[PDB]
Design a protein. Structure first.
Length: 68
């Protein structure tokens, strides 16, 4: 829960909608469907990248500690 609450803020803070309202991103900047794809893939390579590895490592550790 702690890390989830810490990460939800970072997820929203990185949106171009907030950036163009905070002044760092110029208002005359329209996000394209390709930049959205690039950002989503960059996020995915971390989020969905770390999931199967985490599950497999935990399954292996649980099966080792259980003696199977
Ligand atoms: Zn933290």
């Amino acid at each position: 829960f702690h890390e989830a609450v810490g990460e939800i803020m970072s997820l929203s803070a990185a949106t171009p909608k907030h950036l163009k309202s905070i002044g760092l991103l110029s208002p005359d900047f329209q996000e394209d469907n390709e930049t959205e794809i690039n950002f989503l893939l960059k996020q995915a390579l971390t989020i969905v990248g770390t999931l199967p590895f985490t599950y497999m490592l935990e399954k292996w550790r649980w099966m080792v500690f259980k003696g199977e």
